[PDB]
Amino acid sequence: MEIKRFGRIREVIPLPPLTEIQVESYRRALQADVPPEKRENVGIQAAFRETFPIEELVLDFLEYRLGEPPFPQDECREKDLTYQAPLYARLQLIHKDTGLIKEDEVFLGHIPLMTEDGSFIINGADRVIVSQIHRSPGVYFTPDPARPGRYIASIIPLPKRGPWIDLEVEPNGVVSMKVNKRKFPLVLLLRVLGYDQETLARELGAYGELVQGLMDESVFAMRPEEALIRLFTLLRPGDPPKRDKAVAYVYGLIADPRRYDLGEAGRYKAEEKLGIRLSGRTLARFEDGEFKDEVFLPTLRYLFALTAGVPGHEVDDIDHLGNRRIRTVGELMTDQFRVGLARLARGVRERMLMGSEDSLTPAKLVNSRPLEAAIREFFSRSQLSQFKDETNPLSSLRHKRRISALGPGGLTRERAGFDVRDVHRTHYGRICPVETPEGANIGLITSLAAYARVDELGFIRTPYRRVVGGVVTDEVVYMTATEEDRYTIAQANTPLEGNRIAAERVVARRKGEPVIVSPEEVEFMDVSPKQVFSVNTNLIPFLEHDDANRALMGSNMQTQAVPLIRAQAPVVMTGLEERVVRDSLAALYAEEDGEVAKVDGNRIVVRYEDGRLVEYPLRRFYRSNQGTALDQRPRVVVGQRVRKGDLLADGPASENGFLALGQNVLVAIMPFDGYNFEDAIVISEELLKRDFYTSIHIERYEIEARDTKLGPERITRDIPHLSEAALRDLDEEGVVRIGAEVKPGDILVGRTSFKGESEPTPEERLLRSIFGEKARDVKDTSLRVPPGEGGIVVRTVRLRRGDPGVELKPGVREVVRVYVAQKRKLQVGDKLANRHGNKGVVAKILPVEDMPHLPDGTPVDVILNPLGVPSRMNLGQILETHLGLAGYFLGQRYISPIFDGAKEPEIKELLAQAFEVYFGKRKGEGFGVDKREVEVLRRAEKLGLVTPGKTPEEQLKELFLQGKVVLYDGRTGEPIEGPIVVGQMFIMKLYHMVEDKMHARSTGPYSLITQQPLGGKAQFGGQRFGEMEVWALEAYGAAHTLQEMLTLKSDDIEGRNAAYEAIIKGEDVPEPSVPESFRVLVKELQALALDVQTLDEKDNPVDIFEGLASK
Amino acid sequence: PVSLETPIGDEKDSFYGDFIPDEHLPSPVDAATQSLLSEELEKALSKLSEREAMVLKLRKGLIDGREHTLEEVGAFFGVTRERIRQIENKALRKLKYHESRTRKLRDFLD
Amino acid sequence: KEVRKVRIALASPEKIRSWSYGEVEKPETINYRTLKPERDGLFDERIFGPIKDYECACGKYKRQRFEGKVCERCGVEVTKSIVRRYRMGHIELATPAAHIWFVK
Amino acid sequence: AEPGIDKLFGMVDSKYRLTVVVAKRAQQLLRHGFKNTVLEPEERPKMQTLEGLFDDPNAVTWAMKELLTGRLVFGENLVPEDRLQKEMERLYPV
Amino acid sequence: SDPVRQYLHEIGQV
Amino acid sequence: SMARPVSIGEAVGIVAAQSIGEPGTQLTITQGLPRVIEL
Amino acid sequence: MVQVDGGRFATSDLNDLYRRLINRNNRLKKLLAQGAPEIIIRNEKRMLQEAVDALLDNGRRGAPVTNPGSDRPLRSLTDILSGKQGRFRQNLLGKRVDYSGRSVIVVGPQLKLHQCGLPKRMALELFKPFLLKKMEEKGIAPNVKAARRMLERQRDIKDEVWDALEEVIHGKVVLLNRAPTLHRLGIQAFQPVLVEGQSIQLHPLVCEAFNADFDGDQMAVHVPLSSFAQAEARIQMLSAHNLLSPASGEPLAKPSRDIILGL
Amino acid sequence: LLMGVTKSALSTKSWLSAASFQNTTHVLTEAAIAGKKDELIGLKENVILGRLIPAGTGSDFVRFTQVVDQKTLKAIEEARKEA
Amino acid sequence: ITIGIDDAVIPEEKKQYLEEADRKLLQIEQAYEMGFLTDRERYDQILQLWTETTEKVTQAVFKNFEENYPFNPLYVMAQSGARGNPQQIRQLCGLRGLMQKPSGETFEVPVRSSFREGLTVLEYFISSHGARKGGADTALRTADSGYLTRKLVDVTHE
DNA sequence: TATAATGGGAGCTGCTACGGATG
DNA sequence: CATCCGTAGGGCGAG
RNA sequence: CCCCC
Ligand SMILES: [Mg+2]
Ligand SMILES: [Zn+2]
């Protein structure tokens, strides 16, 4: 079909590699493809190079290397393995006394490898390392909140790489330095650095009254050695002030590059702020036996100049994106690698003392367990390592572009006020102002802008076009916020004739401030509107017509869209839906030009120009992290000529290379018998008939048979006391057969466990005697389908002990996995949503004859209530509906770019072209205007919609240009008394489905200590009746219902047992007893040496333990 | 061993031990089932004579908790051990017949 | 009788010893091979009660016909296992220690 | 809304006393098998089965209707508890 | 407040 | 809730607390919920 | 100290704190019997005091004792008692309960004010013992055990048990609750109407008191068991009996949205 | 004396209520020193004890109300007259 | 009752009020550069002018609705109380209005566009500040409200 | 069961606030 | 005036 | 924690 794209803005550059923030970060971190001699002291190299040489025998580092993965990605996902590469390090042990050298390549374990799409495979599960925003290291100057005319100087290094140092001018006049919560006069530390009164007087004397506050005679009287011992006594009281100890401590605190590490970004920020040059990333140096200052004097000078009001000195905006930086995958992984390496170095140093001081190899000295433990900890249990969201390809694409202010080394939720969550003016082009979580995490979790990229220092940069004179060049410069604040940047929609600015006055920004400016003052220009928003926000057509609060929900809900079996791209697109499928490697493309040799459901074989025959296997019905089916379908035919970059196979939720998160449905905006009341949605049974909004979901079940002290657990078809009807679909070994239908209660894998030793009750003795049948040795422990689940068995995986290639955890004989899939039709309670924030649950599925329909008999698909529009202020869905009606009758789709798209007159023109097809067809078929159409036109000209006196066709066209049509009620046949908006809308089926969330419980499992029901549907738990529910029951005065909640329905053991027996016997429920959690409270208070005594009216003790706890 | 207080999620809101059921204490269903078993057993034993039901109750432990030997039940009813063995066998015969007739105690065979 | 009041008060060492069914003299928990509780440990059945209802540890007495009996061989009282939620132990300190609640 | 809920609230000084009366009367009806009812055969609450009309098993509905009739007497200290229970068991045995 | 520092100080008095 | 004299036994303090707390999330030139808590 | 599903062992931190205490106490006794100097005895006594403090209120004084290879403070008795997760607020002033369920809500315009749409399977589970008794009264099952064994498998469920469940719930009401429960009308009593499908159907007029809408809200259902609780729910907690706000005295269940629009 | 809601709630006579509110250690130490007895007057105490709260159907005002049918009432009356 | 994009009716008075506000802003800037009023007074006068212009365009929207389209869907839903309030209808049909910086200080330039016309990326980014601030306000206010409710329950429960 | 060996080692909880007590 | 301790919404599904 | 209300 035809695809019409609007807009006159020409983007000189395409979108960057959308997952480059992960890929390039990890590639720079590993440096695997760089030959070892040619590497850069960064990442793993920098970590090795910081840890070594280990001095004490001397162990030094030569180079490292990474091997090939022992198993591919698919095998890792299959066998619960980590996709990783082996790491080796060539170390030479040197005896500086002997000159002896013993060199060896030691194995340091494995390091996880990043896949092509920017994710990891950890223990079989796909995971994403979310980038972390934080304060950039350096030297900042903030206003002192207590004293207005004074300031605080803050020296900040990298996280975990040293303390924060605070320089302040106290009220008494002396300058204080704050380190590790201790304060002291900065003059003492300056004297340790070798400064004398002459130097400080000549250096800082230009700022009048502060240098005298710096002067302290007793400190200048003593030489730097006495000053060093004095400072050590100040910082470490009680520690005997041995001079070497003081040297070591002060060096490790300030001058040690191993213990104090300003950032490379920190070093650059310090050099740029103070106007100096750093020889390293420490605040001072230990050179020629003494201490030499680096940072302290420039910072003190800047502080004094700022307090005196010296020009050219400013305070620092700490939320400015020039002072806030991103730590990506490489940096975090390298930090944990460095920690593990330091622990390994401690182990090495301890080994260099014990044992034989002569016979030692690098292999005997190195224990790699700390490093492996640190890396495994980071990748498994860190907060920034998250379970990959692969609901649809866009889910993971967005997940990899996430930016978190939380996590280790960052904010807690209470430490986040309004300042951090706020949208800063420097977020422009770097951080999306729209896409952020709704609720407690608002402002903390954000998303990277579309055109944004993180530089090597960690600062987000955005592109701008150079403007010389009045001519806009095609050269683009990626700027940080700090450099961006220098220029006057025009907007991207400023009129142009050729490369020349065609407007007498342009809209521009100066330090984020909007301004009207002459074309001579234009230094740069925005690349595109797309650069201001995230990838999810850029997929919302008519975004300029949507309120931000609802566009946020649209962006966040596109993530939750479920891949449909008949998924299709929207009729109104933004132009990004192809590139998103491209960069999210779900779809398959051709490497070079060539011809398709073979097309199958499982594979595609292509013969290229090179003559080489390349076979691409297709992923078919694979289960994602969230249960959605990831499967690739071929889109080419045998013998088809393809070019470089042509589509070969469609991934999940994609249609011919375009992003397909939902379906285009014919929607009518009108109330309907209260079934769309308060955002609820009414749909047509025709949607289920033609399998719209039908999705495939797979669930994975697992069971282990293990060795017990009572005997082996066995996976077998022989299960005690079970009929052949129960064992029908099980094979010889006890596993359910592939293709069988399983419902709640059915057996997936049969298993027997040896009965725990127990004496049969006398009742069981008599029963056994009456029936004369021996009680079996084993008990039925078979895995069964949980309530509400089931489907078709599509796969079975079995792993035993003693078969080639597999080894389980200790004690486990065998493990079986059963994959069950299900085709889910849309039903009442499932959740739908569009890209504009309109979301609702399906409340009614009407038959087709009850649906409102067009005059030509076409019924609508979805009925949306108009009451959801005015308060929400999201008009983009309305324009989408109008343009979708136009494209429904013209048989075409559209690309309406963001902030530069189809405007009202063009939509009116397309609607006129569509009305021609919609009405002249009827007029040629031999049909005139309908009577009910005439009545609706009467009521419409009463509404002022059509001009009185025109022909019925002219008035119907006037209504059609307003996007409104005559609609017939299928129940009566009479029309709706007014013209109604009808058109094509793109609606998605979200991951929240009633089938997953419906749950109920009569009785079930209870907790160990509290004896209260467990929680969760997966544990068959009960609903929590919290404090506020108890408050509700109290305010109602319902005492017996509340007591049932507190006793019979939970943790009153005798009470609940007697209640169940009485209800199954038809008797009324008994009087409740003491809750067991109260006895737990009493005993835990006794363990705290407090005597809690329940008394009667006579103040006599009452035993709620019933003599069981008293001797 | 691993701590019951091992956190689940990076919220402080849940523990590992909260997901661990109690397999020791009988569920309400199991206690109800055992009670119904005892009651159906007494209903079936009432269809015998007092003496031949008492023989079975004494031999299978429902009374006093111990399983008396044939000599002990015979000496309690004063009879010969073969005598008491015979009345026990005929009581079991009547029980099996009533069971094949009413099909009451079958569901408790699990 | 019906509970009408609840009193809370400090506990003398005498009252703490009157609660205790025995002294936990060992840091042991359960045996590494048998998985049964270690004698004089934190889970000892001689102190806190039987693991199984009306059944001693060694299994000499295994039914309610003995209740209140303490097995001479293994030293476990035959009662309901529920008592393991109720019966307290105690540790006799070699030196008095301050209750931190009344200090901090 | 429960039928005649306004008149039932009118009978009492406290709504919770109405609740107590209804609950205790339903307990009486359940314990004595509805044969202690003050209702007449045509006043008996009915329930529609697949077979047809049967007696309403819900004792609370029975009690509220009985209370609406006015043939029930409620109050405090009307009769010792044991004497009431025993005369009820004499008039309507288990 | 630090038991190890206190014990080391006590050790250093002999 | 019934436009009539309150019944003896009505938990009135709980109703007061709930009535004061329920609109708390709606309190926004104005001091608002900080002022309410200050009082 | 319990064995979990996979045979692994899980234990409380109180056991480790008690072990610390007992080890230090026995070592103090042995040092006293062997005539140790006063420095050693003093160190041991101070460690014993620290261990008792750790057992009673860990982290109260000094650094909190942690398990090896972990920064997680061990959970002492004070930690068990106090806090949002403490015994009082978590297990005494509120509990997880039996005979309760939860599901997504859907607008039920055809409902009367005193009614709510309840899914069939939710009702079968919530009223399960009543349903067993009714299946025993009718000839559907020989006894309660057979009725439960029959309900266990979903394919063994015939259509007479649905009629029996209709008979069971006759006249009774359930409690619907939506979090957050800001006022007493966050819980309301409704007569249930059994419905096919997995969604709870809520009356429109009560959506304002619950602050409920249908963009994905879920609600919990509870079954008052006794005749007393059922009477309390039907009289005091019924939705149709609470039409005015206890705060302002104004109408709370009143026309809104589409109703106001049409009128 | 005027004290805020927090201090007033912490100062209540019931130690179960105050200890379940906040500052559990302080409340419990002072209550254990004083040998305090909680009379179970309020709602939180009986909720903790799993008791029937003194409100609504649990109020002593309406709790003991009896119901009796006229047939049984008069049979009881004649039985009490003949004694 | 339905909602098309034409049901958000821009009053003819909007352009008049906007040109009047522009001439007034020019007068204020001229009276500033001649040094008659401070930067403070000029900023305050700009804010007040735009506030009054916003009120004027709101009244114009609703008067045009009342007189020429009394059965307009937005107007019907607002007047009946079914949905919407005057300020949201103003944002739909009039102007978006003044937006505030993260500091709470208000921008000199207002958002002249309405959601029917569509904003500019700059105006959208300017509004995002207030949107985020309101979100954080609600998120941090729910906890205080719940804490206060629990305090009141604990103090009044008996 | 014997060469001699003689004072630890992390490096935060790091971007909040507010008030009720005790010093 | 400092310093220590103490609170800081609820329910909910997965992993 | 992440998501939903
Ligand atoms: Mg909602
Ligand atoms: Zn024994």
Side-chain angles (χ1 to χ4, degrees), chain A residues 678-679 839 872, chain G residues 105 178 211-218:
Chain A
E678 283 282 27
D679 309 326
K839 54 176 178 182
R872 276 63 181 268
Chain G
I105 55 176
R178 176 192 176 272
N211 197 34
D213 54 358
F214 308 98
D215 54 9
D217 299 26
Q218 301 178 222

Side-chain angles (χ1 to χ4, degrees), chain C residues 56-61 71-76:
Chain C
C56 69
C58 67
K60 185 178 178 183
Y61 311 86
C71 185
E72 319 87 15
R73 195 178 306 170
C74 67
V76 183

Side-chain angles (χ1 to χ4, degrees), chain A residues 406 413 441 560 839:
Chain A
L406 307 176
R413 192 153 301 116
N441 286 324
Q560 311 166 22
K839 54 176 178 182

Side-chain angles (χ1 to χ4, degrees), chain G residues 170-204:
Chain G
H170 189 259
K172 284 179 178 175
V173 295
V174 303
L175 305 185
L176 294 199
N177 168 239
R178 176 192 176 272
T181 304
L182 302 180
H183 50 201
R184 79 179 178 188
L185 294 134
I187 304 182
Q188 286 182 39
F190 294 91
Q191 188 181 98
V193 177
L194 295 197
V195 299
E196 318 278 328
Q198 299 175 109
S199 286
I200 300 169
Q201 297 178 354
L202 187 72
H203 195 278

Side-chain angles (χ1 to χ4, degrees), chain G residues 8-228:
Chain G
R8 297 278 309 208
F9 270 93
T11 187
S12 180
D13 295 338
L14 290 184
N15 289 317
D16 276 323
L17 297 163
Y18 276 129
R19 288 200 320 109
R20 286 168 33 89
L21 181 52
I22 295 203
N23 278 325
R24 297 188 170 182
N25 199 47
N26 295 340
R27 193 198 298 124
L28 178 57
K29 274 181 285 193
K30 185 158 174 298
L31 288 166
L32 286 179
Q34 291 186 335
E38 272 303 319
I39 306 186
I40 299 178
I41 298 298
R42 187 198 314 187
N43 196 30
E44 190 62 35
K45 289 181 179 179
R46 135 154 36 90
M47 291 166 56
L48 190 70
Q49 177 66 51
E50 223 102 26
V52 179
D53 296 336
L55 167 71
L56 297 187
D57 195 356
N58 186 15
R60 189 58 263 258
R61 181 206 112 93
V65 27
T66 72
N67 261 331
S70 174
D71 302 333
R72 184 187 67 82
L74 297 186
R75 197 148 189 263
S76 60
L77 302 152
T78 296
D79 301 322
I80 296 176
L81 283 199
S82 55
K84 222 159 74 172
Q85 314 299 324
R87 191 67 73 210
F88 281 117
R89 300 176 65 173
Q90 200 69 25
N91 311 112
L92 260 17
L93 298 174
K95 303 172 165 72
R96 298 196 173 277
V97 289
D98 282 334
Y99 302 102
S100 62
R102 144 176 301 261
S103 184
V104 174
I105 55 176
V106 139
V107 58
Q110 84 294 342
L111 297 167
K112 299 308 173 186
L113 189 63
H114 66 276
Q115 292 177 331
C116 73
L118 188 60
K120 293 189 316 164
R121 318 209 175 268
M122 288 188 56
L124 167 126
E125 186 60 33
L126 291 165
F127 299 87
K128 203 186 197 68
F130 307 91
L131 184 55
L132 301 174
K133 179 53 192 176
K134 192 70 65 177
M135 283 183 295
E136 193 180 31
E137 289 177 319
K138 321 185 83 171
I140 310 182
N143 69 115
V144 177
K145 189 78 190 305
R148 189 171 194 88
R149 209 232 302 107
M150 165 184 175
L151 290 193
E152 279 179 333
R153 302 191 76 213
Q154 194 198 68
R155 55 176 68 261
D156 298 342
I157 299 178
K158 54 199 60 179
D159 297 79
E160 308 103 69
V161 313
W162 300 116
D163 300 310
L165 183 61
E166 298 276 5
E167 304 195 27
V168 153
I169 71 161
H170 189 259
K172 284 179 178 175
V173 295
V174 303
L175 305 185
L176 294 199
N177 168 239
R178 176 192 176 272
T181 304
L182 302 180
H183 50 201
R184 79 179 178 188
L185 294 134
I187 304 182
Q188 286 182 39
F190 294 91
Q191 188 181 98
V193 177
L194 295 197
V195 299
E196 318 278 328
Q198 299 175 109
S199 286
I200 300 169
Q201 297 178 354
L202 187 72
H203 195 278
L205 291 184
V206 307
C207 286
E208 179 178 321
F210 290 99
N211 197 34
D213 54 358
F214 308 98
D215 54 9
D217 299 26
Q218 301 178 222
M219 277 185 175
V221 196
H222 302 267
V223 177
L225 300 181
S226 67
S227 301
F228 237 114

